[PDB]
Enzyme design. Structure first.
Site, PDB file in Angstrom:
ATOM      1  N   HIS A 176      -9.987   1.020  -0.623  1.00  0.00           N
ATOM      2  CA  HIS A 176      -9.674   1.843   0.541  1.00  0.00           C
ATOM      3  C   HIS A 176     -10.989   1.864   1.305  1.00  0.00           C
ATOM      4  O   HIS A 176     -12.025   2.207   0.741  1.00  0.00           O
ATOM      5  CB  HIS A 176      -9.326   3.278   0.147  1.00  0.00           C
ATOM      6  CG  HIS A 176      -7.882   3.509  -0.182  1.00  0.00           C
ATOM      7  ND1 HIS A 176      -7.365   3.325  -1.447  1.00  0.00           N
ATOM      8  CD2 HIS A 176      -6.867   4.003   0.568  1.00  0.00           C
ATOM      9  CE1 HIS A 176      -6.100   3.706  -1.465  1.00  0.00           C
ATOM     10  NE2 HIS A 176      -5.774   4.123  -0.256  1.00  0.00           N
TER      11      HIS A 176
ATOM     12  N   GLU B 262     -10.532   3.571   6.729  1.00  0.00           N
ATOM     13  CA  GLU B 262      -9.505   4.494   7.179  1.00  0.00           C
ATOM     14  C   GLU B 262     -10.204   5.590   7.967  1.00  0.00           C
ATOM     15  O   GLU B 262      -9.834   5.898   9.102  1.00  0.00           O
ATOM     16  CB  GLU B 262      -8.788   5.122   5.997  1.00  0.00           C
ATOM     17  CG  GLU B 262      -7.890   6.273   6.407  1.00  0.00           C
ATOM     18  CD  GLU B 262      -7.264   6.972   5.224  1.00  0.00           C
ATOM     19  OE1 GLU B 262      -8.009   7.354   4.295  1.00  0.00           O
ATOM     20  OE2 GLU B 262      -6.029   7.146   5.228  1.00  0.00           O
TER      21      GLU B 262
ATOM     22  N   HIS C  89       0.778  -1.234   0.000  1.00  0.00           N
ATOM     23  CA  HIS C  89       0.000   0.000   0.000  1.00  0.00           C
ATOM     24  C   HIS C  89       0.818   1.297   0.000  1.00  0.00           C
ATOM     25  O   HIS C  89       1.295   1.761   1.044  1.00  0.00           O
ATOM     26  CB  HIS C  89      -0.975   0.008   1.178  1.00  0.00           C
ATOM     27  CG  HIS C  89      -2.040   1.050   1.058  1.00  0.00           C
ATOM     28  ND1 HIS C  89      -3.266   0.942   1.681  1.00  0.00           N
ATOM     29  CD2 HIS C  89      -2.075   2.212   0.365  1.00  0.00           C
ATOM     30  CE1 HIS C  89      -4.008   1.989   1.371  1.00  0.00           C
ATOM     31  NE2 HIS C  89      -3.309   2.775   0.574  1.00  0.00           N
TER      32      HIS C  89
ATOM     33  N   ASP D 197       2.239   4.429   2.531  1.00  0.00           N
ATOM     34  CA  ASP D 197       1.175   5.218   1.909  1.00  0.00           C
ATOM     35  C   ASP D 197       1.643   6.376   1.022  1.00  0.00           C
ATOM     36  O   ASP D 197       1.564   6.281  -0.197  1.00  0.00           O
ATOM     37  CB  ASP D 197       0.198   5.724   2.968  1.00  0.00           C
ATOM     38  CG  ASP D 197      -1.199   5.858   2.423  1.00  0.00           C
ATOM     39  OD1 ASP D 197      -2.140   6.077   3.214  1.00  0.00           O
ATOM     40  OD2 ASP D 197      -1.350   5.731   1.188  1.00  0.00           O
TER      41      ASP D 197
ATOM     42  N   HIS E 117      -6.263   0.094   4.836  1.00  0.00           N
ATOM     43  CA  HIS E 117      -6.530   0.587   6.190  1.00  0.00           C
ATOM     44  C   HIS E 117      -7.585  -0.308   6.862  1.00  0.00           C
ATOM     45  O   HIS E 117      -7.256  -1.334   7.466  1.00  0.00           O
ATOM     46  CB  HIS E 117      -7.022   2.038   6.136  1.00  0.00           C
ATOM     47  CG  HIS E 117      -6.071   2.975   5.457  1.00  0.00           C
ATOM     48  ND1 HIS E 117      -4.965   3.501   6.086  1.00  0.00           N
ATOM     49  CD2 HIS E 117      -6.051   3.463   4.194  1.00  0.00           C
ATOM     50  CE1 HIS E 117      -4.306   4.274   5.244  1.00  0.00           C
ATOM     51  NE2 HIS E 117      -4.945   4.269   4.087  1.00  0.00           N
TER      52      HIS E 117
ATOM     53  N   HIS F  42       1.060   5.025  -2.731  1.00  0.00           N
ATOM     54  CA  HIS F  42       0.658   5.747  -3.934  1.00  0.00           C
ATOM     55  C   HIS F  42       1.841   6.389  -4.659  1.00  0.00           C
ATOM     56  O   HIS F  42       2.585   7.160  -4.079  1.00  0.00           O
ATOM     57  CB  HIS F  42      -0.358   6.851  -3.578  1.00  0.00           C
ATOM     58  CG  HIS F  42      -1.532   6.381  -2.765  1.00  0.00           C
ATOM     59  ND1 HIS F  42      -2.818   6.364  -3.261  1.00  0.00           N
ATOM     60  CD2 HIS F  42      -1.624   5.975  -1.474  1.00  0.00           C
ATOM     61  CE1 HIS F  42      -3.652   5.973  -2.311  1.00  0.00           C
ATOM     62  NE2 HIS F  42      -2.953   5.731  -1.216  1.00  0.00           N
TER      63      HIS F  42
END
Ligand SMILES: C[C@H](O)[C@H](CCc1cccc2nc(-c3ccc(Cl)cc3)oc12)n1cnc(C(N)=O)c1
Ligand SMILES: [Zn+2]
Length: 349
Positions: free
Chosen positions: A211, A214, A12, A292, A235, A14
């Site tokens: 996702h 979170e 995970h 992340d 998450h 980006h």
């Protein structure tokens, strides 16, 4: 000093949140945009953050640099390439990096992301270029890399192209689809374009992650599982507010993609209570440790491992169990998954 001084696995993170400050300067300068600073670290302090902030505060970060990177054909290849290099230093042997091809596009994409004037960079070649930079990175720095493509909660019209993009570039890095960008909007999990895309994902064998949890209620976590058919949850801390859901995911071996540092800097987790990860730890839950957005959060994988062991008492065995689960849950073919597991088994002794 480093916490887990062993090879790691990351599922995970980006791409558009893991760009070197210097590379943004280079492009912002050479294109005609100018950033809120012209010195590397200066730019790293203004678009980064050292203390928790609100959602819009967080979102503004992208508003600064993204217009400098998005649009340029070689800016996208370089960021991907430099990404693999970054993981190498973190000691990662396998990493799955995600991103929204559309948010880097400047042609055939409505609306057109971050203001930005039209052009000729279509979403389709944006991912093909990332593939390229990613593959070179793999051969040059020695890390196995795969890419996940992201759908955006608010723009379900882009979802079909996403699955198609996943199917088209099957093998060539892209092994799964993702749903991102504000799980907070009502009924977004159930938007027809999103559910149809994930339905298509099952019908063509492309893996799935969403996702959820979170900063969204357990119900959105449930929609992701029951409706979109996810195999992993990004998450998913809120799945704790629903026990039959949690109890069910436990026995079904759902994988949770945890990012402890990120959950702090975004407000997802209040320092008042005990992180959702210790609960998972004590329950032998299949989850992973993730960075992340290393740029915005001025961190590295180590940053997250330090925290788990510093303020949560994580032992080296938990770190091993953890990364091994990460490898079982990866979206790697079974042959390459066995090879991956094997690697870590031998290196973890
Ligand atoms: C999917 C992509 O890589 C992105 C795009 C960033 C972005 C662009 C446009 C609208 C966006 N909305 C979000 C967003 C993400 C989480 C919440 Cl709870 C609310 C809004 O992120 C956005 N990204 C990168 N890092 C994150 C992140 N950490 O959530 C999202
Ligand atoms: Zn994320």
């Amino acid at each position: 000093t480093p916490a887990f001084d062993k090879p790691k696995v990351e599922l995970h993170v980006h791409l558009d949140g893991a760009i070197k400050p210097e590379t943004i300067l280079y492009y912002g300068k050479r294109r005609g945009i100018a950033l809120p600073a012209d010195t590397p670290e200066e730019l790293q302090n203004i678009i980064g953050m050292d203390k928790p902030l609100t959602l819009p505060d967080f979102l503004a970060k992208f508003d600064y640099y993204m217009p400098a990177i998005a649009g340029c054909r070689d800016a996208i290849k370089r960021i991907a390439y430099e990404f693999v290099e970054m993981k190498a230093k973190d000691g990662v042997v396998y990493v799955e990096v995600r991103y929204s091809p559309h948010l880097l596009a400047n042609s055939k994409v409505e609306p057109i992301p971050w203001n930005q004037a039209e052009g000729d960079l279509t979403p389709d070649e944006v991912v093909s270029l990332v593939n390229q930079g990613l593959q070179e990175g793999e051969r040059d720095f020695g890390v196995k890399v795969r890419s996940i493509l992201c759908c955006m909660r608010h723009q379900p019209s882009w979802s079909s192209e996403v699955v198609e993009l996943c199917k088209k570039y099957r093998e060539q890095t892209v092994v799964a689809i993702d749903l991102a960008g504000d799980e907070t909007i009502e009924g977004s999990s159930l938007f027809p374009g999103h559910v149809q895309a994930y339905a298509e994902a099952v019908k063509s064998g492309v893996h799935r992650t969403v996702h959820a949890g979170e900063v969204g209620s357990a119900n959105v976590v449930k929609e992701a599982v029951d409706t979109l058919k996810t195999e992993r949850l990004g998450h998913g801390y809120h799945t704790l507010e629903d026990t039959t859901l949690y109890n069910r995911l436990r026995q079904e071996n759902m994988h949770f993609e945890i990012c402890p540092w990120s959950s702090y800097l975004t407000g997802a987790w209040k320092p008042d209570t005990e992180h959702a990860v210790i609960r998972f730890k004590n329950d032998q839950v299949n989850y992973s440790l993730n960075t992340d957005d290393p740029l915005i959060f001025k961190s590295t994988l180590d940053t997250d491992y330090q925290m788990t062991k510093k303020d949560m008492g994580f032992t080296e065995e938990e770190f091993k169990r953890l990364n091994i689960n990460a490898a079982k849950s990866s979206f790697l073919p079974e042959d390459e998954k066995k090879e991956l597991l094997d690697l870590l088994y031998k290196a973890y002794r």
